RNA sequence: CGCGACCUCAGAUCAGACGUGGCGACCCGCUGAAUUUAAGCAUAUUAGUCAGCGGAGGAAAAGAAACUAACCAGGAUUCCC
RNA sequence: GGCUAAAUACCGGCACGAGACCGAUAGUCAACAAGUACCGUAAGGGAAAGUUGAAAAGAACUUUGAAGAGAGAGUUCAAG
RNA sequence: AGCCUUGAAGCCUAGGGCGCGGGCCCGGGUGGAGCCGCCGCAGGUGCAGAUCUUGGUGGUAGUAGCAAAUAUUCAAACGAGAACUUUGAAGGCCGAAGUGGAGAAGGGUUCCAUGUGAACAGCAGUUGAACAUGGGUCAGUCGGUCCUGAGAGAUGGGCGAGCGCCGUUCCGAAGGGACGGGCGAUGGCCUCCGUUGCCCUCAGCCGAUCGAAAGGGAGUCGGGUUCAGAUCCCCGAAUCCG
RNA sequence: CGACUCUUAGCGGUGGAUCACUCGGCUCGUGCGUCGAUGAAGAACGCAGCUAGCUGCGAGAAUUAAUGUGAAUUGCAGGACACAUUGAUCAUCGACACUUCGAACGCACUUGCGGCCCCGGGUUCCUCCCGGGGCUACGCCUGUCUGAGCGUCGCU
């Protein structure tokens, strides 16, 4: 009966939240036991339930964000947190298309006088 | 049975926050 | 009476903690830090004190975000991918 | 003084908690070298400055 | 002689990486040879010691022919604890002595799915080099 | 704040609150003196919470 | 008077963007001493150097002659001898 | 009026390799909870400090003393 | 084809010797892991001094000293232990401009309970503001919070190589508000009232912002209660603001 | 006699030199050469069953997910209906997350005051109170909307 993140992947948001609340209640009851003479078994359970809560919240955040990305996929304007991070300078570069652009003057020059492959006899 | 066990693509609109939904409505 | 007797009269704090650099060099009356120059936008830094620069330069603190860039840089800042699942 | 700011009262509290002796089990750790808290403070011998 | 430009033979660098090795590396470091019987059977020479292996101590005060089970792989201290390899304190209680894994011989391997996978890979690599010399 | 504390104590333990007093302790923790409504017996409620 | 073009100029929590600060070994633009040497010292030297200010990038700056030459001529910039 | 790689620079950074170098008053101030303790209102100033043993086997128990400390005993190749 | 766990370096030595000497060899002891001869190479290579640097230790020396502000005594208790702790009784002092009861600034847990008596408290201590383990600061009404004072300080503008500085109403299109009126759109206790958008109308303030735990500034008092908190907790009786 | 003093030696102290060691320096060389309003550097405050510092992390707080790995972590304890495709531990690190201040951004720096929109609980549609969520800084470019001018004009 451990909370493994694989068992939470498909569940629905209201289901997971209910599961979260049980863990939040279970923890607050333990925090009481910490100061009222809880058994060493109950003190060790706190970390087990702190991380279980974090496991549930991770899966809730991941499931929400994976669906938000599906939602804004085709949209021209996406929320900043859904945009590629990289670095600030790497986000201000000319993109792939703009770097590949050439003027018609340069395009003509490469067509007429392409670099050739040759050899010079010994 | 305890021993037997122990020895071995589209948006989901329910997961979108309620705020985003209203904006498209 | 410019020594021991006068040292008893001092009960008024000239400086207090600065909220930018956290050092007790924030002049209350001038509203300025004698260490970091707050509220000035730019950090107060001088080359006639190398020892002072190395006390508060990059890397002397947590490097909360920079040291993750150093990790991400080694994989070309890959994003939106995960290792092939089991 | 009694008249205190929140920031000052909070900074004082952190100084209060740091001022305690080390756990005695720390001595039994494998590579441990610490014998005592060498950063102890006394309100009279040395002052915080703020 | 070592020719790899990216492998250091510096004494201090090599010691810092030994004494600060992470656990999953200390495991590899804490390997033991196999008995002559196991060596012949699996065509493997050394295995990373593991709990529930049975070993002989071949060096030191506790050397002998007594086969004992490994009860603890204390990786932080780079020692293993063995059955009956022990002594008494002042107050008369018994305490295990730490033998280095390199000073024992594994006579029986705690086998499971992953141990077998590890064993086969080592022999497959060995046999490849065998057919390189031929 | 006192409003949030009152709403928390009621919801968590299904009790009623008469007033909430708060002080911030010298170690930096906030202590709440939550007085329950007269029809709620604090010694009884403490048993429910496991305090006693 | 009214309507309408343009010009100049304002206000927006208008739609979408962009600059700010840090590091600073190397780089670019400024500003810029005095110890010191001169067996004194003022020009000079220290030295376009320390200190001060600004701006960058993985390099920067420079760079395809309003050049060098005076030869039977060379042929952008940068670096080494 | 303008753009332009390469050869060139690099006592900061990330990651490495080496040395006729130093070897704890040396070598970085910093081999260690060091830009730490500590001083100064502040700008700033700024240390000392490595080593039981192969392994904690780190001295049970007895006895004098309020105790610190001792006398026996025991571990260790060695507590010389 | 050097020495070394059958014991290296180091260190000690009224042991034996060598050399003019710089020095070196051997014996014994301690020590516990490395070292040396010869031919060449290299140098951060030889200490008595520098009021040399850092560290350690002497004589001085059980010495100077533990002498400013009148003063102690008796009995008992705990305790291994008492001139110094506690209780009782005496005798004294501060003498309401106090050695009294409370605060501001500063301190920051020194507060309270229990325990220890190693270090500290320049004798001692059973004691302490030391150490150790745990506690303790409760508000609409007490302050902050607001106002502006001397002043500090943005924007406009000016200057300035520049980080920036000057400047505070001065080179400014500096009001985002409103009674009411007219238009639509929406609502609900859809009756008629609200809300919301537009238009008409009206508007000096004219200087953002900061600046006082003693200035200005509504309104809380009595009784009880703790080891330590109370005009704050409880009982009671009020009040201001919205 | 013997004290006391001196010299030498044995033993014992004080002291920490010497020797041996070295997870540290220093110097040279090589590859790359990467910060920030998508909130950097730096700072403050928190987070462990027992945890002061160092270290790591951020209310999911000595870490979550995932991948590799394959039986530990360990000072003591404990074992969640923890542990072998129901994967300990460590490593990696692409998913998610990341309190307050800080260029630091509603206005100010006292955890002081707002304003706009939405939502939820109070009651009972509006109000009102409470709580949550999102906005509200300067400059600047493109466009938009709304305007001004006894600026230049045209038709009325
Ligand atoms: Mg053209
Ligand atoms: Mg003043
Ligand atoms: Mg004092
Ligand atoms: Mg081998
Ligand atoms: Mg906009
Ligand atoms: Mg001269
Ligand atoms: Mg001269
Ligand atoms: Mg002169
Ligand atoms: Mg010159
Ligand atoms: Mg310079
Ligand atoms: Mg600058
Ligand atoms: Mg810049
Ligand atoms: Mg860059
Ligand atoms: Mg260029
Ligand atoms: Mg040329
Ligand atoms: Mg150019
Ligand atoms: Mg030293
Ligand atoms: Mg030292
Ligand atoms: Mg040193
Ligand atoms: Mg020393
Ligand atoms: Mg030395
Ligand atoms: Mg030594
Ligand atoms: Mg010995
Ligand atoms: Mg002698
Ligand atoms: Mg040794
Ligand atoms: Mg040398
Ligand atoms: Mg000398
Ligand atoms: Mg005397
Ligand atoms: Mg009093
Ligand atoms: Mg008084
Ligand atoms: Mg004393
Ligand atoms: Mg007291
Ligand atoms: Mg009341
Ligand atoms: Mg004010
Ligand atoms: Mg000004
Ligand atoms: Mg006031
Ligand atoms: Mg902590
Ligand atoms: Mg995980
Ligand atoms: Mg895993
Ligand atoms: Mg104020
Ligand atoms: Zn500052």
Angle between helices A13-35 and A40-71 (to 10 degrees): 150
Q: Which of residues 3-42 of C touch A (CB under 8 A)?
A: none
Phi-psi region of E64 (alpha: psi -120 to 50; beta: other; left: phi over 0): left
Q: What backbone phi and psi angles, to 5 degrees, belong to E104?
A: -125, 175
Alpha helix (H) residue ranges in E10-71: 11-19, 23-29, 36-42
What is the distance in angstroms measured between the alpha-carbon CA of A57 and the sugar C1' of I29? 75
What tokens does F21 get? 């007093």
Interchain contact, A85 vs C80, CB within 8 Å: no
CB neighbours (10 Å) of residue E59? 11
Is residue C56 part of an annotated ligand binding site? no
What tokens does F45 get? 């409620």
Query: What distance in Å separates the CA atoms of residue E134 and residue E121, rounded to the nearest whole number?
Result: 20
| Contacts (Cβ under 8 Å, ≥6 apart) of F52 | F43, F46
What tokens does E96 get? 């295990």
Query: What distance in Å separates the CA atoms of residue C73 and residue E32, rounded to the nearest whole number?
Result: 39
- F19 to chain A nearest CA, in Å? 23
Which parts of C1-86 are beta strand (E)?
15-16, 26-27, 32-33
A71 touches chain B (CB under 8 A): yes
Give me the residue label for tokens 């250091």.
E8
A87 touches chain C (CB under 8 A): yes
Residues near ion ligand 41 (Cβ under 5 Å): C 18, 20-21, 33, 35-36, 38
Cβ–Cβ < 8 Å for C1, C11: no
User: From chain F, which residues contact D within 8 Å (Cβ)?
Assistant: 24-28
Query: What distance in Å separates the CA atoms of residue B12 and residue A22, rounded to the nearest whole number?
Result: 25
Number of A to F CB contacts under 8 A, please give it.
Answer: 8
Cβ–Cβ < 8 Å for F52, F46: yes
- Three-class SS state of C15: strand
Query: What distance in Å separates the CA atoms of residue E40 and residue E107, rounded to the nearest whole number?
Result: 12
Give me the residue label for tokens 């059955």.
E83
Which CA distances in Å does A64 have to A58, A60, A79?
A: 10, 6, 14
Question: Order of strands, edge to edge, in the sheet holding C15-16?
Answer: C15-16, C26-27, C32-33
Single out the residue of E126, E116, E109, E113 nearest to residue E37, CA to CA: E109
Single out the residue of E122, E119, E109 nearest to residue E51, CA to CA: E109
Please give the full DSSP string across A38-85, using - where no structure is assigned. Answer: --HHHHHHHHHHHHHHHHHHHHHHHHHHHHHHHHSSS-SS--GGGS--
Q: Resolution of the coordinates in A?
A: 2.9
- D23 to chain C nearest CA, in Å? 26
């Amino acid at each position: 009966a451990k909370i493994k993140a694989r068992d939470l992947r498909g569940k629905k948001k209201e289901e997971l939240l209910k599961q979260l609340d049980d863990l939040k209640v279970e923890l607050s009851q333990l925090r009481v036991a910490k100061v009222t003479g809880g058994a060493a078994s109950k003190l060790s359970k706190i970390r087990v339930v702190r991380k279980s809560i974090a496991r549930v919240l991770t899966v809730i955040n991941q499931t929400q964000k994976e669906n938000l990305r599906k939602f804004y996929k085709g949209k021209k304007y996406k929320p900043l947190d859904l945009r590629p991070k990289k670095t600030r300078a790497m986000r201000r570069r000319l993109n792939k298309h703009e770097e590949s652009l050439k003027t018609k003057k340069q395009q003509r020059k490469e067509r007429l006088y392409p670099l050739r492959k040759y050899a010079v006899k010994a | 049975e305890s021993r037997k066990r122990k020895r071995p693509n589209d948006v989901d609109m329910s997961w979108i926050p309620q705020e985003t939904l209203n904006q498209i409505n | 009476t410019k020594g021991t007797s006068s040292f008893g009269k001092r009960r008024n704090k000239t400086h207090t903690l600065c909220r930018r650099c956290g050092s007790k060099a924030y002049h209350l009356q001038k509203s300025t830090c004698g260490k970091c120059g707050y509220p000035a936008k730019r950090k107060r830094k001088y080359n006639w004190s190398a020892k002072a620069k190395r006390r508060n330069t990059t890397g002397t603190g947590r490097m909360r975000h920079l040291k993750i860039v150093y990790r991400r840089f080694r994989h070309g800042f890959r994003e939106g991918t995960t290792p092939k699942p089991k | 003084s009694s008249h205190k700011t929140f920031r000052i009262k909070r900074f004082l509290a952190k100084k209060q908690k740091q001022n305690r002796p080390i756990p005695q089990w720390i001595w039994m750790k494998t590579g441990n070298k610490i014998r005592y808290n060498s950063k102890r403070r006394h309100w009279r011998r040395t002052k915080l400055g703020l | 002689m070592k020719f790899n430009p990216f492998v250091t033979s510096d004494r201090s660098k090599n010691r810092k990486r030994h004494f600060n090795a992470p656990s999953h590396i200390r495991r590899k470091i804490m390997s033991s040879p196999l008995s002559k019987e196991l060596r012949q059977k699996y065509n493997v020479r050394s295995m990373p010691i593991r709990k529930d292996d049975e070993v002989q101590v071949v060096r030191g005060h506790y050397k002998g022919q007594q086969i004992g089970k490994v009860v603890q792989v204390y990786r932080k201290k780079y020692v293993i604890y063995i059955e009956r390899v022990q002594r008494e304190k002042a107050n008369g209680t018994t305490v295990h002595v730490g033998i280095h894994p390199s000073k024992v011989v594994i006579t029986r391997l705690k086998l499971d799915k992953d141990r077998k996978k590890i064993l086969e890979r080592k022999a497959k690599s060995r046999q490849v080099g065998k057919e390189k010399g031929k | 704040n006192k409003h949030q504390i009152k709403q928390a104590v009621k919801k968590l333990y299904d009790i009623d609150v008469a007033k909430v007093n708060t002080l911030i302790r010298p170690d930096g923790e906030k202590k709440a003196y939550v007085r329950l409504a007269p029809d709620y017996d604090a010694l009884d409620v403490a048993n429910k919470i496991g305090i006693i």
